[PDB]
Design a protein around this ligand. Structure first.
Ligand SMILES: Nc1nc2c(ncn2[C@@H]2O[C@H](COP(=O)(O)OP(=O)(O)OP(=O)(O)O)[C@@H](O)[C@H]2O)c(=O)[nH]1
Ligand SMILES: Nc1ncnc2c1ncn2[C@@H]1O[C@H](COP(=O)(O)OP(=O)(O)CP(=O)(O)O)[C@@H](O)[C@H]1O
Ligand SMILES: Nc1nc2c(ncn2[C@@H]2O[C@H](COP(=O)(O)OP(=O)(O)O)[C@@H](O)[C@H]2O)c(=O)[nH]1
Ligand SMILES: [Ca+2]
Ligand SMILES: [Ca+2]
Ligand SMILES: [Ca+2]
Ligand SMILES: [Mg+2]
Ligand SMILES: [Mg+2]
Ligand SMILES: [Mg+2]
Lengths: 52, 331, 425, 437
């Protein structure tokens, strides 16, 4: 049981008690544009199907 | 209508309980992976306690205590007694034991030399070697916990033979500790030669390596054992042994109660335990091990399983003289 | 504002459609003249989903009325709420479809579909954010079945990213007009399988039985059958018409109810179905009735299959704590009838405003694999005639050939098989 | 003084955000119009409350917050609510159609078309910060916008604000209030994509809050308003160290330092006490030892789990009210023996303690009784992995049959992202096991 780093102020106090010793912008755009492309491809096939 | 699932097809006990639950006309068995259950008769190993208590509107009960393995492992029990102040290393009813990683080798040697300075030990783990030489035991492990071998066991007569006592204990969700009235002695059909068929009282050893000569299946029940004590030793099972057993059972379970209790938990637990006791010629009881998934003597399956339904299952899920002794403990 | 465009086509579609607007118009306080006369703010909360606002605070249903003969639509214009519908949104022909799918889909319907799509385009163009369309029709006739599915195909082509939902009346020999109904129903089911996201299967066989057995109507009429459908249509659209959290729009409903694209045919159910009625029902009673087959209008037995997803809606001032308890009771008692590989597939909603003439009610929406019985029933009737090519001339005279019938039957047999495989998973 | 920006995504984040800023204004004595009498520095200053509130020449203290939702109905509550005068129009962003409980819709389809607008609005707040610590992101796991758009935004924030800390307040799905069957999919999809971009995330399971409301507050059928008032209290105790004078958790970086030794395991468990029904005429006032003990009762945790069967990597105690260090040390010593507290060997066995003297603020007319002292404990225990396993199991059952998968593929997502997300969660579960057992 040890108490360390006791700090006191008007609002309160704190202390420590010891009881025992990323992807780039370009890569994000590719992901989003790739997904948009797959959506556009699937819609085109549907419209092609409806055209038939 | 209550529902339950079965996740351990190899449980002789809860197979009977499953049979009884259906025989009440008020319990419905579900698929083993159906999560909308009231009761789980779960698997021994890797029971998913983390998926219990998260079904809205379902009171869920399981037949195992998470963390009870600490009491049901050769090394876990050994460490538990030493490091638990409630049990202490000065524990008088537990044989001197050490954990040897294939570590407490140094401490075991310190006592071993101090003894030779009865010095026989038995090494076992989860294949047993009983040797009077530390070399044979230590080498056997590396090829486990070394425990003192009781060189002065109480031998039944006629037969001059060794035995052990199996006690079944049921702990319910409220953490009441129930001791089944009916115990069993697993006697050795062979005379105690101080070969291992007479030193080891395991049922398989007796039925594999004089079996059945003295008692049916080397199983002597309490009434016969009690009569023998009255005749041979002018005493009773209750006074000479049974008080020490209830003290040992209560101490072990009270010790871990704060760690495994489900008093304010999102699911409830109960569990049946098998305690193994050794009795020495001074009529002192010794704790050998605690079984987490014990079987039962065939004659005692019906009474015990019904009692499990009565106090453990029907207490949480009610239907439309007690066979247990309630070891009254404190919070 | 997420608007829904309503289309009702053919005799059955227009009679059921007219009753639907009569029902919900009352629930929202809208009178036959289009003027709001309600007392609760919940009424006007999401009124824009089904109604447009006009000059003088008039509310005009966003409904398009379609038929190839003026008969039924003349009745609507003279019906109770005939004056509430926008006159422009009446689109009708004169030839009729003669209970012929080919006429509604290929010859007579094709001549009129474009002027219908012009009206649809006009409603959609003024939608702040259109969510999709709902269609009311029968599958057994010629206009609702044949032209209705033609409209769906053309709506999907022009609005491929919007939700398509239909209320579809399944034919039954017990309530039949012509022997060719199985032919027309089979041809439509394939259209529905491909081009709708959500289809409420309303079986006239179930509606008749409920009227005869439960409601104690000796000689049910089409009006009596439509009384059940109006009540059901009100219940299943409550989540769209009033404030709430669950299935608030068509797309979210589809996501919760349709685990596989082709298996999107729902069994509706309504409770109570009391005959002559002042006695209030308890929450346990509403729940048990709601899950009983006798309250379901698809003429399938749920215990013969398994539920993939279930939506329950409770209306009226009741104990919500008790509603959750009763719903949890039903699932836990009969857990063998809910597939184990979709956890928590039962979603419950509650609406304060009850339906007219009831203190509380429950509406059931189930995606059960038992629906394969309804498609099996149609498949048997179709095949009985098709093996002998009976009555086919009515269709080959309009340009169809037998191969199209063979595919339609084969496609529906596949649908039944797909329902069977997931019932054993 | 360094500013913190709050971002609220989806219905759950927005409604929770409104509840917190209602509490913040009460705690800092800020009226709904934004005026703050106790602030003598009109139109400026680097006081502690300026971390969350900027100031205008008129004297209005404007929250450093942005609300974003793909549907306008929820953010319209803020526009016309009690604290409507607090925010300005640029801070509220709404679309016209939501993600329909579909992660792919929120992330790719709708998110791609609205992300740049959100970032631009955040840039406006960032440019008004002398030194920006980072962001606090509030959102649900199960919602399509909460899961899908948040993961996109977190990625972009890591790009445009690379050196800034990002903390999460996440709502874990619970069927008793869940609105969709595919919530397990969205939870795992967003956790996988967000895992590398969040320095510290606080998970709140709606199941736990729901039971605490029914049991402690005697609420038969708790609603979102009940749930959010309680959640805002826990959030307030977590963020108080950033808004008041103090020496513990004074900046977002310190949250990582004190609670997350392993970057992947950055989900501290929160336990709060006491929760007292305001309907009680007179309430017994619990002591420091009593509330400190309640921090080890599973029934008071934000996520139901059993820490007794896990290992601790860090523990922090945040006290508000009449608390003095002497009583804290006595309570800790008492519990440190009786209670089952098992640390890991590669961490110190200690507690970082923070005391704020102002007792918890109760929203007038709320469900929580005004208490004289409360505590929130932040403990990074492996027991919280039970929540991941529960979620992962439900994911497995639906994904074995590919149930609902077509909805995500239809939005442009590849089916492989399902398995890739699941394998990550399997790795995450392994990480917890390697540290706790
Ligand atoms: N605690 C709490 N949970 C909420 C609240 N609102 C929604 N939730 C939970 O959030 C999940 C649904 O996600 P939402 O945030 O509503 O969805 P969303 O972010 O708006 O995204 P969309 O699908 O586009 O609507 C469910 O699990 C709800 O239980 C709230 O106000 N408080
Ligand atoms: N320390 C000791 N002193 C004396 N005999 C001992 C002993 N440890 C074990 N034995 C004997 O050896 C036998 C086997 O011991 P042990 O309990 O390890 O087998 P086991 O664990 O399989 C019991 P069970 O079959 O109930 O699980 C005991 O029944 C007892 O007769
Ligand atoms: N429930 C109900 N079913 C109807 C109604 N009118 C017709 N039907 C059914 O619809 C089928 C006939 O189709 P119908 O709508 O008359 O053909 P259409 O006018 O060409 O679209 C038959 O199965 C009838 O049983 C009605 O008012 N209510
Ligand atoms: Ca013509
Ligand atoms: Ca100032
Ligand atoms: Ca980062
Ligand atoms: Mg053993
Ligand atoms: Mg007709
Ligand atoms: Mg939303």
């Amino acid at each position: 049981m040890e108490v360390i780093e006791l700090n006191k102020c008007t609002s309160g106090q704190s202390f420590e008690v010891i009881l025992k010793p990323d992807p780039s912008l370009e890569e994000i755009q590719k992901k989003l544009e790739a997904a948009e492309e797959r959506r556009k491809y699937q819609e085109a096939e549907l419209l092609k199907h409806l055209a038939e | 209508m209550y529902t339950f699932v079965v996740r351990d097809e190899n449980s002789s006990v809860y197979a009977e309980v499953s049979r009884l639950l259906l025989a009440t006309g008020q319990w419905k068995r579900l698929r083993k992976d159906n999560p909308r259950f009231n009761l789980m008769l779960g698997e021994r190993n890797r029971l998913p306690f983390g998926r219990l208590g998260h079904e809205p509107g379902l009171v869920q009960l399981v037949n195992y205590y998470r963390g009870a393995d600490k009491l049901c492992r050769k090394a876990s029990l050994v460490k538990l007694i030493k490091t638990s102040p409630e049990l202490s290393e000065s524990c008088t009813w537990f044989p001197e034991s050490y954990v040897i990683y294939p570590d407490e080798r140094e401490v075991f040697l310190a006592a071993y030399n101090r003894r030779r300075e009865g010095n026989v030990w038995i090494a076992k783990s989860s294949g047993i070697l009983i040797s009077s030489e530390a070399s044979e035991l230590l080498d056997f492990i590396d090829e486990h916990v070394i425990q003192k071998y009781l060189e002065k066991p109480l031998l039944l007569e006629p037969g001059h033979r060794k035995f052990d006592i199996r006690s079944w204990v049921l702990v319910d969700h409220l953490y009441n500790i129930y001791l089944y009235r009916e115990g069993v002695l697993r006697t050795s059909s062979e005379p105690y030669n101080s070969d291992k068929t007479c030193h080891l009282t395991n049922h398989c050893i007796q039925k594999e390596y004089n079996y059945g000569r003295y008692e049916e299946g080397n199983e002597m029940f309490f009434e016969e054992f009690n009569q023998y004590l009255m005749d041979a030793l002018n005493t009773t099972l209750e006074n000479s042994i049974l008080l020490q057993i209830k003290h040992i059972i209560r101490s072990c379970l009270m010790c871990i109660e704060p760690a495994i209790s489900t008093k304010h938990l999102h699911y409830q637990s109960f569990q049946l335990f098998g305690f193994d006791f050794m009795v020495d010629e001074e009529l002192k009881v010794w704790l050998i091990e605690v079984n987490g998934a014990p079987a039962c003597a065939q004659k005692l399956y019906a009474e015990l399983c019904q009692g499990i339904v009565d106090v453990a299952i029907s207490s949480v899920f009610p239907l439309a003289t007690s066979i247990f002794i309630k070891l009254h403990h404190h919070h | 504002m997420r608007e829904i465009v309503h289309i009702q086509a053919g005799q059955c579609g227009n009679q059921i459609g007219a009753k639907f607007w009569e029902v919900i118009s009352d629930e929202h306080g809208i009178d036959p003249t289009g003027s709001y006369h309600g007392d609760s703010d919940l009424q006007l909360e999401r009124i824009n989903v089904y109604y447009n606002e006009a000059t003088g605070n008039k509310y005009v249903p966003r409904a398009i009325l379609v038929d190839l003969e003026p008969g039924t639509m003349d009745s609507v214009r003279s019906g109770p709420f005939g004056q509430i519908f926008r006159p422009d949104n009446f689109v009708f022909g004169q030839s009729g479809a003669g209970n012929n799918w080919a006429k509604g889909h290929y010859t007579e319907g094709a001549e009129l579909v474009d002027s219908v799509l012009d009206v649809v385009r006009k409603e959609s163009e003024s939608c702040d954010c259109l969510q999709g369309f709902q269609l009311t029709h029968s599958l057994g006739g010629g206009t609702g079945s044949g032209m209705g599915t033609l409209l769906i195909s053309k709506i999907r082509e022009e609005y491929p990213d919007r939700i398509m939902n239909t209320f579809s009346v399944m034919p039954s020999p017990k309530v039949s007009d012509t022997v060719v109904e199985p032919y027309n129903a089979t041809l439509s089911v394939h259209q529905l399988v491909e081009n709708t996201d959500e289809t409420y299967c309303i079986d006239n066989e179930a509606l008749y039985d409920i009227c005869f057995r439960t409601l104690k109507l000796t000689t049910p009429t089409y009006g009596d059958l439509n009384h059940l459908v109006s009540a059901t249509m009100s219940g299943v659209t409550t989540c769209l018409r009033f404030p709430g959290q669950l299935n608030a729009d068509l797309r979210k409903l589809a996501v919760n109810m349709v685990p596989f694209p082709r298996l999107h045919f729902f069994m509706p159910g309504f409770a109570p179905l009391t005959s002559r009625q002042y006695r209030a029902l308890t929450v346990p009673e509403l729940t048990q009735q709601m899950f009983d087959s006798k309250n379901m209008m698809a003429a399938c037995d749920p215990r013969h299959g398994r539920y993939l997803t279930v939506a329950a809606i409770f209306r009226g001032r009741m104990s919500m704590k008790e509603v959750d308890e009763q719903m949890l009771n039903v699932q836990n008692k009969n857990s063998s009838y809910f597939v184990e590989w979709i956890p928590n597939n039962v979603k419950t909603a509650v609406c304060d405003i009850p339906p007219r003439g009831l203190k509380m009610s429950a509406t059931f929406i189930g995606n059960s694999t038992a629906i394969q019985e309804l498609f099996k029933r149609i498949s048997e009737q179709f095949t009985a005639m098709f093996r002998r090519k009976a009555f086919l001339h009515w269709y080959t005279g309009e340009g169809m050939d037998e191969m199209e019938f063979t595919e339609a039957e084969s496609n529906m047999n596949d649908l039944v098989s797909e329902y069977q495989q997931y019932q054993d998973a | 003084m360094r500013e913190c920006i709050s971002i609220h995504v989806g219905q759950a984040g927005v409604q929770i955000g409104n509840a917190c800023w209602e509490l913040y204004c009460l705690e800092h004595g800020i009226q709904p119009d934004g005026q703050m009498p106790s602030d003598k520095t009109i139109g400026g200053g680097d006081d502690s409350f300026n971390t969350f509130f900027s100031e205008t020449g008129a004297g209005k203290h404007v929250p450093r917050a942005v609300f974003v939702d793909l549907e306008p109905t929820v953010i319209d509550e803020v526009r016309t609510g009690t604290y409507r005068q607090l925010f300005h129009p640029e801070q509220l962003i709404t679309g016209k159609e939501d993600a329909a409980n579909n992660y792919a819709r929120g992330h790719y389809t709708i998110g791609k078309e609205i992300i740049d607008l959100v970032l631009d609005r955040i840039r406006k707040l960032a440019d008004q910060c002398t030194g920006l610590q980072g962001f606090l992101v509030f959102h649900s796991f199960g919602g399509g916008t909460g899961s899908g758009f948040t993961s996109l935004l977190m990625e972009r924030l890591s790009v445009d604000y690379g050196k800034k800390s990002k903390l999460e307040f996440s709502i874990y799905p619970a069927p008793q209030v869940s609105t969709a069957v595919v919530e397990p999919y969205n939870s795992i999809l967003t956790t996988h994509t967000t895992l590398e971009h969040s320095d510290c995330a606080f998970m709140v399971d709606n199941e736990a809050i729901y039971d605490i409301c029914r049991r402690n507050l005697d609420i038969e059928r708790p609603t979102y308003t009940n749930l959010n008032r309680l959640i805002s209290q826990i959030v307030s105790s977590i963020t108080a160290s950033l808004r008041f004078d103090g020496a513990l958790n004074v900046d977002l970086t310190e949250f990582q330092t004190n609670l997350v030794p392993y970057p992947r395991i950055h989900f501290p468990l929160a336990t709060y006490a006491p929760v007292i029904s305001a309907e009680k005429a007179y309430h017994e006032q619990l002591s420091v030892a009593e509330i400190t003990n309640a921090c080890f009762e599973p029934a008071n945790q934000m996520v139901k789990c059993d820490p007794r069967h896990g290992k601790y990597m860090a523990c922090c105690l945040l006290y508000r009210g009449d608390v003095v260090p002497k009583d804290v040390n006595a309570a800790i010593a008492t519990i440190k023996t009786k209670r089952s507290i098992q640390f890991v060997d590669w961490c110190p066995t200690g507690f970082k303690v923070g005391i704020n003297y102002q007792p918890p603020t109760v929203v007038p007319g709320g469900d929580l009784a005004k208490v004289q002292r409360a505590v929130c404990m932040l403990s990074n225990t492996t027991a919280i992995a039970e929540a991941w396993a529960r979620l992962d199991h439900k994911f497995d059952l639906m994904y074995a049959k590919r149930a609902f998968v077509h909805w995500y593929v239809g939005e442009g997502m590849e089916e492989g992202e399902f398995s890739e997300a699941r394998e990550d969660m399997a790795a995450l579960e392994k990480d917890y096991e390697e540290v706790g057992v």
